[PDB]
Every structure is written in C-alpha cells, then in structure tokens.
Amino acid sequence: ESLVDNVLSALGLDPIGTIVDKILDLADEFGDWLGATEDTAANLSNLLTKLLSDPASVIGPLAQSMITGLTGALGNLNTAINQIGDVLVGTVVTPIN
Amino acid sequence: ESLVDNVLSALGLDPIGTIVDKILDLADEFGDWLGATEDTAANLSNLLTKLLSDPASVIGPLAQSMITGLTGALGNLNTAINQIGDVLVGTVVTPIN
Numbered sequence: 001e002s003l004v005d006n007v008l009s010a011l012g013l014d015p016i017g018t019i020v021d022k023i024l025d026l027a028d029e030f031g032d033w034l035g036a037t038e039d040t041a042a043n044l045s046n047l048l049t050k051l052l053s054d055p056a057s058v059i060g061p062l063a064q065s066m067i068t069g070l071t072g073a074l075g076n077l078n079t080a081i082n083q084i085g086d087v088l089v090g091t092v093v094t095p096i097n
Numbered sequence: 098e099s100l101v102d103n104v105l106s107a108l109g110l111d112p113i114g115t116i117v118d119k120i121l122d123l124a125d126e127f128g129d130w131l132g133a134t135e136d137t138a139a140n141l142s143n144l145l146t147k148l149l150s151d152p153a154s155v156i157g158p159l160a161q162s163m164i165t166g167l168t169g170a171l172g173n174l175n176t177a178i179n180q181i182g183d184v185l186v187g188t189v190v191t192p193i194n
Contacts, residue, residue, distance in 0.1 A: 003101070003120050010127040033134075040138055047145065062152045069161060073171055080178055097182075 004022045008015040011029045015022045050058050064070050080096050087093065101119045105112040108126045112119045147155050161167050177193050184190070 002117075003123075006120055006124040007127060010124040011131060036134060036138065040134075040141060044141060047141075058148060059152050059156075060149050062156070066153050066156070066158070067161060067164070068158045070167075073161075077174055077178070084181070097179075 001019055001022075004019065004026060005015040008022060008026055008029070011026070011033075013025055013029055015025070017025075047058065064074070076096065083093055083096060098116055101116060101123065102112050105119060105123055105126070108123070108130070110122050110126055112122065114122075144155065161171070173193065180190055180193060
C-alpha cells in the first residue's frame with residue numbers, strides 16, 4: 001500500500017480509498033501518461049513534417065531584416081534607381097556601379 | 098522485491114538498500130519522469146506558439162537562396178539595371194522585357 005501511495009503521490013493524484021480504488025486510479029493515471037507521451041511524439045513528428053514540406057501555415061510573418069542581405073540588396077536597387085533619376089536633372093553623385 | 102528491482106533497473110537507478118529505500122528512490126524517479134515529460138510538453142507548446150507569432154528570435158539567419166524565386170528576381174532586376182546602363186554607351190545586348 002505504501003508503494004501504491006508513494007507512486008500515486010509522485011504522479012500527482014492523492015490516494016484516498018481502498019487498495020483496489022488506488023490501483024484503479026493508478027491505472028487511469030498511466031493511461032493519461034500514455035496519451036500524453038503519444039500525443040507529444042505525434043505532435044513533434046507532425047510539426048517536423050509540416051515545417052519540412054509546407055512552412056507557410058506554421059511559420060508566421062517575419063521581418064525582411066531577418067533575411068541575410070535582403071535589406072542591402074533592396075537598398076542598393078533603390079539607390080540605383082534614385083541615382084538614375086537624379087543624374088538626368090543634375091546633382092552629381094557618386095555612381096553605385 | 099523483484100518487481101521493485103526490475104522497475105528501478107529499467108528506469109535507471111541501481112537499487113541498493115531496503116525495500117522502503119528502493120520504493121522512495123522509485124518515487125523520486127517517477128517525480129523526475131513527470132518533470133521531464135511536463136517540461137518537454139511545455140517547451141514544445143512554447144516553441145510552437147513562438148514560431149507562429151514571432152519567428153525572428155527562434156529562427157536564425159537564412160540564405161536568400163532558400164526563398165523561392167528571390168535570387169531570380171534579384172538577378173533579373175540587376176541585369177535590367179546593367180542593360181539600362183550599357184545601352185546608353187553602346188554594346189548592343191538582348192533586351193530583357
């Protein structure tokens with residue numbers, strides 16, 4: 001009975017009742033344990049597979065600055081366009097390339 | 098005694114002492130098991146929520162080539178700018194668009 005009670009206390013449930021009732025509660029607790037473990041494993045596998053195949057739904061919107069060199073390339077292109085516009089009216093500027 | 102011994106051996110600890118001490122060690126092992134399971138579940142849930150809401154912190158820097166068509170679009174724009182620059186001085190080239 002002490003083994004049963006200590007195991008039940010460790011798993012969370014408070015042991016009150018007969019040995020049979022405590023054992024039944026212990027069995028239900030291990031059933032919930034099985035459910036939790038299998039659900040965690042399945043969720044991890046599903047998340048891995050979805051993140052590999054289709055990362056749209058799982059991953060939310062992200063800032064352009066996170067991409068390496070994206071902001072640099074966009075700035076270079078915009079500055080090139082601005083310089084192209086400016087040279088035609090004057091305002092001598094250092095060419096980009 | 099053999100049930101306690103086999104369970105403790107399966108869960109990892111080496112059972113040395115009385116049956117009461119082995120039972121206490123078994124209870125502590127199940128407590129650590131519970132901690133591990135709950136922490137794994139919480140970490141998975143937190144990672145899922147963070148990846149859905151704000152993916153900047155969790156996800157590290159990534160190469161532009163991973164994005165579909167980003168390198169193609171950047172190359173097309175750069176080649177268009179280069180052709181615009183080149184035509185004004187000569188060197189007849191195939192137009193892009």
